[PDB]
């Protein structure tokens, strides 16, 4: 809400909980984290697979671009000579 | 359940609160990092499509260039 004013309120709020409610609330917060982690791992693997594909595709585009370039200047020279 | 009876409760309440805060704080860095991971890997997906087309298009040009190189080859 306000960045520090909120932490103040929010920490009082945990202060006015019992230890056992805090342990309850917290055990849920872990649930949520190991769920997020898992998705992190899924997301990192999919990003790594896609940048490999971009990698491969980029090379072939280079491999081919340079082929075309050469050809193109061969076709100019061998054309004008006519 | 109770692997935690012991973990969280050797701790003082004040330690727990500390522990709960920092855990909130990293759930939150991680939602940001996961967001970035979702967006990035959808951009990279756009990318691949853009590259699959530039490739196709480059192949059409390669075929033309080659067929022309071949015409000239035959006129020699």
Determine the length of chain B: 76
Task: Say whether B20 and A26 touch across the interface (CB within 8 A).
Answer: yes
> Between A and B, how many CB-CB pairs are < 8 A?
101
Resolution in A: 2.1
**Which two three-digit tokens encode residue A51?**
């940048």
Three-point CA angle A2, B21, A38, nearest 5°: 110
- What is the Cα–Cα distance from B31 to B25, expressed in whole angstroms? 10
Method used to determine the 3D structure: X-ray
**Which two three-digit tokens encode residue B42?**
């959808």
CA B71 to each of CA A26, A72, B68: distance values in angstroms, whole numbers, following the listed order: 76, 13, 5
B6 touches chain A (CB under 8 A): no
Q: Are B47 and A54 in contact (CB under 8 A)?
A: yes
Three-point CA angle A18, A19, A22, nearest 5°: 90
């Amino acid at each position: 809400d306000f960045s520090e004013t909120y932490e103040r309120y929010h920490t009082e709020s945990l202060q006015n909980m019992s230890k056992q409610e805090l342990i309850k609330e917290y055990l849920e917060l872990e649930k949520s984290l190991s769920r997020m982690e898992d998705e992190n791992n899924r997301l990192r693997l999919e990003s790594k697979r896609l940048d490999a594909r971009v990698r491969e595709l980029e090379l072939e585009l280079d491999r081919l671009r340079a082929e075309n370039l050469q050809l193109l200047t061969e076709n100019e020279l061998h054309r004008q000579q006519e």
